[PDB]
C-alpha cells in the first residue's frame, strides 16, 4: 500500500512501462456531486502516450447527477499527485484520482473535484490564504450484519451487534460470533474510551491505521466514542485539494478492511435513535507565507485578528444556505431534534455545547496551533463540495467586512460575555450588562487596543438552524449568491441539485412506516 | 495458459513430437451455425504424418445443424497459427482451432469459420480492405445458481444472486455465501462503477484477464455495469478471421474460471426482466497498405471519405436481415421493447441513443481511431456468421453506390441536422429546415468542399428495426441477395436455417406460462 | 335458490317490500367489455319508487375498459325479467341484472349487455329472425390449488391436483386429501367418460347442477371429458339475451360451489400445455313464427335453405374480426397450435375435425333438431360481446347475398364433395372432380331440385384462422364495417378496445420466461 508520487504526466508513463514495478492494472477514481466512489481498470499494455493526455472513453448517461441531455461520451482526465499502490491477488494496481470532462477540456460543471480545483485556485489569486489547511475527524459504526425491507406488507429492520448490549437478536444464526455472553458488552452512551474486553474491533482499528500510515494518510489519534461500536479516526492536516482526496480513500479503506473481517461499516447520521450521530469536525486554518492569516501576536482577542471573526461570520451568515450541502439527507436532521451534545444555536463559542463553531482554547500563545472547528457537516455528502462552499461562504465574509457577532458564552441559558470582550467592543444595544460575571484565563493589568476594539462586534441574538430539508433547500434557493462568484457554482448546477433532493422528499414520505401503526391505528 | 504459434502445418508436427514441451493432448475447436463449443482430445503418440493432411474422423449426425441426408462421416482439418498451451492436471494441452470438411476437401457450406474464411478472401481480392480489424466488448451476469424446470404443474424458476439486493431468496441451504447481509448489496440500476465491498466478484475479473494476457487476447478495459452483478470485457482490436477465433475462446474462458469459483456467468440477452441485457459493440475499421479506408485528411465530413458512409449505408439497409443473424433468439427481442438505452430507429448519429450505428467524437482528427460502433449483435449467436454477414452487407453498400442517410441527431424527438451537414448535401426535400440550431465543435469559417458535398445524401424518415423473429426471417427471406454473392451462403444455407428457427418459435409458444395464469383466470 | 319472474318495475316494488317474501338485500350485477361479474349490495329500507326509474350512483372510474374523461358518476338500470333470490347466512337476496347508462338514459356505448339488447331488437325490426335460440357447452377444469408469482428471481408455477397421474407435487402439505395414491388418478388424455374412483369431484356436480335447475337453468347433459379434471355442463336452449345473462350467473355459480368445497374452478382455454383446452360450442338457430328459419321441408341440401349457408358464409368470411372478441387472450392462440382436435381451415363439414361450423347429421328430418355449432370461441371473453359479434356477422351474410362455400369434407388430406353437393352446384373450376368418392346417407332414385342447384356455390380453397392477437386485430382493424351497421359498435368502441388489447401483448412480451432460461443459455 506505499505510496507514490509524481510532477508531470510524463513521469505516470515512464513510472507504469518500467518493469521492475510490475504495475499491471491502472484504476481511475470519479465521485458524484453526491458522495459515491467509482472506479474502472485499466491495463497497462494498451496506455499509450496519446490516452493520457487524451481521457478515458466513459459513458455517464447512469451516474446520478452527471449527464447532460446529448452529450452521452464523456472523458476521464487523468491527474497526477495523488496515487498509491496496492497489492490484490499478486498484482499491482495504481489508483489515480481522475476527473472528468468535456469534449474539448472545458471544465464540467458537475464535476465535484474540478470545482475545489476552482476555488482554491480562486482564492490564492487575491494574494489570500495561498494555502488552506483543513483537519477532519471521521466517525463511523461497525455493525455486523444489517437486513431491511421495503415490501408494502414486510418492511423491517434488523441491526445485529456484538457489543452492544441492548440488541437482543441472537448471533447463532449467522454462520467470530463464538459466545454470546452480556457480560462483556457495552451499554448505552457508556463506552467512551473502552478496551479490549468490550471493544470487541480493536484488530480491525491497526489494521485501518496500518494501512493509511502506509499511503503518508497519517493519523493523529484514535479512540471508541459514546455509542456502542462508534469509533473515531483524527487525521493529520492537509492541503484542502488533498484533503477531500484522502477523505474518499479513506472511507473506501474503512469499508474493505472492516468488510474482510465479515463486518459492515457505516457513515450514516444517526442510525440507532437511542445513540449518538456521526460528524465531521473540520478544524480549519489559512496560511500566508508560511504564517497564519488567524494570528496577530497580541492578547484580549485572543491573539486572533480581525481578518479570522470575518472568516467566522461568513459561516454563520450563510449557515442555513450550508446545510443544503454540509448535511444533506433526511437522517441528518435526526441528529439535531434532540440538541442534547447538538447544536441549537447559530453562533460561535469557545465552551458552550450548543455552538456551531467552536473555538480552541489549547495553546493559545501558539500560532501554529490556530484553528475553526466547524461541527455542522456530515460524512455522507461529498467532500469537495462542502469544503468548497464552507471557503467560498467564508471568503464572502472577508470581502463584505460586515461586523462579527459576539462569542456568547452561556453557562445555562444566561449568555455571557468574557472579559476580553466586555472592554469596547459593542457602542450600542447593551443588554447582555447583567451578564458579565467571567474571570477567563489569568491576566492581570491588562491592555485595550484601541483599533481592534471599536464596535466591530454586533450584540444581537444569535439565530437557530434549520431542521428540515425543505427549510434548507428553500435557503439555498434564495441564498446562492456567495457561490457563483466567478461562475464556479452555475446557476443551472445549483437548479439541478434542489431538483435532485426534492425528488427524494417526496418519495420519502410516501412511505408508511411501522411508527404510523403505533400511533393511527 | 502461454500461447504458441505457427506457420505451417510441419511445424506443428516438429513442436508437438519434441519431448522439451511434454505435450500430451492434442485438442481440437468447431463450432455450429449456432453458437457452440465441441471439443474432442487426441493423443501425441498416434499421431502421424498422414493425420495432419487428412482430417480426423468425426460423426456429425448428432449435432445441431450439421447433419447431410448420406453424409454420415467428416473430417476435421486442423488449422494452424489459432493455438494455446494449458496445464490441466499437470498435462500439457494443446488447444486448435479446426475446420469441418467433406471427403473431396471441398469447403463445407454448413460450417461458419469456413464463411470468415471466404468472406475475408473474397474482399481482398478487390483491392478494397485487405485488412478488417474489428474490436468487440463483451457484457456478461455473473449468477451463483439458477435453477429451472418445465413440467406441465411445476414450472419455476429461481436465479440465486450475491450483489443484488431485490433478489430476496436465501442462500444459507447453499453448501463463500458466509453473513447475508443487504447493507453491501447493490440496488437496481444503480451500480455503474462499483467496488470492492458491492462487487462481490473482483477476485475473478483479475483471474481472466490474466488468463487472456497470457494467450495474448490483450484487455483493454474492465468494469461493472449497470445492473446488479454485470460485467464488462473490452478487447485489443484483431484480425476479423482472429477475432472470432478469440470471442469463442474468451467465452469459455469466462465460464470455466467463473465456475471454479462455484458460480454460473451467463451471455442471454436480457435475463432480469428489470435489468440491462448484454450487447456487442463491434468496433469496425478497414485498411488498406496500413491506410484507413475511413478517412480523408479534411474537415465539414469529419474527416470521413464517401467510402464509409457507403459502407454505413450497406449495414442500415439491410439491417433487418442481420437481424436474423446477430440476434436470433426469442430472448433477444426482450431486449428491444421497452426503448429505455435501446435502439429504436434504424440510422447513424454521434450522440442518440436510440440509434444503431454510433460515430466516434473521440480524437477526430486522429486517423487510427477511425470507427463504426454497431450495436445491435448479441453474443449468442455464432460469432463466425455475425461478422460475416456484416462485411457482406457493407461491402453492397460500396459496390451498389446509392446514397447514404443523414446522420440525424435527435435533441428530443425533434431529429437536427448537424452545421457540416447543413451545407449543400441535400438539394430536393427541404423538411427539416427549422431543425437546424447546432453549433458542433468549434470550427470557424468553415470551407465548403465541392465535390465531397453534392446532393450525396438523401433525406428520408429513419425505418424502424424488426421486434421479433417473425419480421426478421421474413425480411431474410426477401433480403438474402447480398449474402449469395460468388456463393458464400449458399440457397440452401439460408433455407435450412430459417426451417431451423421456425421450429423454435413454434415450440416456443406452446409453452404455458405464468404470466397466463395471472392475467387471464 | 328459486327464480322468480316479473313483468313490470312497479311488481318489483310490490314484491320487494312484501313481507311474507322476507327479501332483506337487492344486489346488482354488472358486466364488462371483457368478462367480469361486478355486484353491489342495496337494503330494501331505504329503495323508494323513484330510485327505480333513476338508477343508483355508481362511480366507474376504476372499472378496466368503463371510464369517459369527464363522466365520473354514472348510474345503473335496474332491468327485470332476470332475477333469483338466495338464502346467504339466512337473509334473502335478490340478484337482478342491471345495465349502465349515462345521466340522461342514453345507452352507453362501452355496456355490452346494452349491446345485446340493441342488436337483437335490430334483426327483429326487419321481419328476419324475431327470436334467437343459442345453446351452450361450458368446459371447466376443477384445480385444487394454484400458486404462482412473477418476482423476477422467484417466478413460478405450482398447479396441484389430485385425478392427475402426471402432477407429482405432494398434497400432504395442504392442510379432503387423505391418502395420496397413484392407483385412483387418471392419466393423461385417457379420462373421457369415468366413474367414481377416479372422477374425485361428482358430489359436486349434483350440487352444481342442483342449483342450475332450481334456477330454471335447466341441464341437458354432464360428463368429465378428455383430461385429467375437465368437466362438461350442456344447457338447454334459450333466447340470445337470456342466454348471456344465463352464462355470467352459471360462471359464478360454478366458481362458488367450487369453491365452497375448497378448490379452485377455471375456465382457461389452454391450461397445463399437454392436455386439452376449454371450448364453447355455440348451437345457433333462427325463428320466424315458430318456424325455423332454417329449413326448407326437401332434400338433396340436407333439407336446408340457402337462407342458412348465407349464415354461415357471413361467419366464414368474417371470422378473423371475431376473433378479436371471441377468443382475444394470449392464451387462446395456445389452444390452436398443435391441431390436434382442433380448427386449422376456415369451411364448414359434417364430420371434419378441422371444421370451425359443424352440422348436425343427428335427426336431419327433424326441423326442431337444427343449427349451427360455432367451435371457436372461449369462455374467457364477455358473452354479450362475443354473441352480438355473431349475429351482426352472420346478418350481413343474408343481405349481402353473395356465394356460400362448399362444404368440404375431407378424409385425410383430400377434401371430397358430397354426392348432395356433387349434383349441379358449381359451373366453373372443377377442380375436385377426382375426388367425388361418397355415398354419403341412404338415398335412392334423388331429385335434383332446379332454383336450389344453381352455381350457388364458389369453389375456393377454404382459408386458415388467425394464430395470434397481431393478426386478429388487425383483421379487426380492416374489417370493422359489418359491426358499425346502426351505430351498434361505434368506431370509439372498437378503437378503444383494440388500444386496450395493445397494451396486453406489450406487456406479455417483456416477461422473462424459463423456457428462455432452457433454450437460450
Known amino acids: 500500500m506505499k505510496s507514490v508520487s509524481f510532477s508531470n504526466n510524463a513521469e505516470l508513463y515512464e513510472y507504469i512501462k518500467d518493469k521492475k514495478n510490475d504495475v499491471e492494472i491502472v484504476a481511475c477514481i470519479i465521485t458524484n456531486l453526491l458522495g459515491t466512489y467509482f472506479k474502472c481498470f485499466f491495463y497497462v499494455k494498451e496506455i499509450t502516450l496519446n490516452k493520457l493526455e487524451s481521457g478515458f472513453s466513459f459513458d455517464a448517461s447512469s451516474i446520478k447527477l452527471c449527464s447532460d441531455t446529448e452529450v452521452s461520451d464523456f472523458f476521464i482526465k487523468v491527474d497526477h499527485s495523488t496515487c498509491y499502490l496496492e497489492e490484490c491477488d499478486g498484482k499491482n494496481i495504481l489508483n489515480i484520482m481522475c476527473d472528468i470532462k468535456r469534449y474539448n477540456g472545458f ?32 466517525e463511523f459504526f461497525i455493525f455486523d450484519k444489517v437486513n431491511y425491507s421495503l415490501d408494502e406488507y414486510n418492511t423491517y429492520l434488523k441491526v445485529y451487534d456484538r457489543e452492544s448490549f441492548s440488541c437482543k437478536n441472537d448471533l447463532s444464526s449467522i454462520y467470530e460470533y463464538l459466545i454470546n455472553d452480556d457480560s462483556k458488552k457495552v451499554k ?20 485501518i491505521c496500518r494501512a493509511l500510515n502506509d499511503m503518508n494518510i497519517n493519523v493523529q489519534r484514535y479512540h471508541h466514542e459514546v455509542s456502542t461500536s462508534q469509533h473515531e479516526i483524527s487525521l493529520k492536516y492537509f492541503d484542502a485539494l488533498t484533503n477531500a482526496d484522502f477523505l474518499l480513500i479513506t472511507k473506501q479503506i474503512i469499508k474493505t478492511t472492516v468488510s474482510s473481517f465479515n463486518r459492515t461499516a ?5 442510525p440507532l435513535v437511542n445513540d449518538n450521530g456521526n460528524g465531521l469536525h473540520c478544524n480549519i486554518s489559512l496560511w500566508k507565507n508560511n504564517k497564519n492569516i488567524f494570528y496577530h501576536n497580541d492578547p484580549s482577542t485572543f491573539f486572533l485578528s480581525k481578518e479570522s471573526f470575518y472568516f467566522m461570520y461568513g459561516i454563520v451568515k450563510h449557515a442555513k444556505a450550508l446545510q443544503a450541502f454540509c448535511n444533506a439527507t433526511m437522517n441528518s436532521y435526526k441528529r439535531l431534534v434532540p440538541g442534547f451534545e447538538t447544536c441549537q444555536k447559530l453562533f460561535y463559542s469557545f465552551g458552550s455545547r450548543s455552538a456551531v463553531i467552536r473555538l480552541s482554547l489549547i495553546n493559545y500563545s501558539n500560532p501554529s496551533e490556530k484553528r475553526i472547528e466547524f461541527r455542522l457537516p456530515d460524512c455522507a455528502n461529498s467532500p ?10 467564508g471568503y464572502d465574509g472577508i470581502k463584505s467586512k460586515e461586523q462579527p457577532l459576539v462569542p456568547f458564552e452561556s453557562k445555562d441559558n444566561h449568555f455571557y460575555i468574557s472579559s476580553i470582550f466586555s472592554k469596547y467592543v459593542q457602542h450600542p444595544e447593551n443588554f447582555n450588562i447583567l451578564t458579565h460575571a467571567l474571570e477567563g484565563y489569568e491576566s492581570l493589568h491588562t491592555i485595550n487596543e484601541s483599533p481592534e476594539f471599536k464596535n466591530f462586534f454586533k450584540c444581537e441574538e444569535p439565530q437557530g438552524i434549520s431542521f428540515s430539508l425543505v427549510e434548507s433547500l428553500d435557503a439555498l434557493e434564495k441564498d446562492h449568491a ?3 462568484v466567478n461562475n464556479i457554482f452555475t446557476e443551472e448546477m445549483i437548479q439541478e441539485y434542489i431538483k435532485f433532493k426534492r425528488e427524494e422528499i417526496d418519495a420519502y414520505n410516501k412511505y408508511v412506516n411501522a411508527y404510523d401503526y403505533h400511533l393511527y391505528y
Open 107 to 138: 471544465d464540467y460543471y458537475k464535476c465535484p473535484r474540478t470545482i475545489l480545483k476552482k476555488t482554491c485556485e480562486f482564492v490564492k489569486n487575491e494574494g489570500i490564504a495561498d494555502k488552506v489547511c483543513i483537519g477532519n475527524e471521521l
Open 188 to 207: 448505552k452512551k457508556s463506552g467512551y474510551f473502552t478496551t479490549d474486553p468490550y471493544d470487541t474491533s480493536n484488530i480491525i482499528k491497526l489494521r
Open 266 to 270: 457505516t457513515f450514516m447520521p444517526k
Open 384 to 393: 469537495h463540495l462542502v469544503m468548497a462552499a464552507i471557503i467560498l461562504a
Open 482 to 484: 456567495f457561490l457563483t
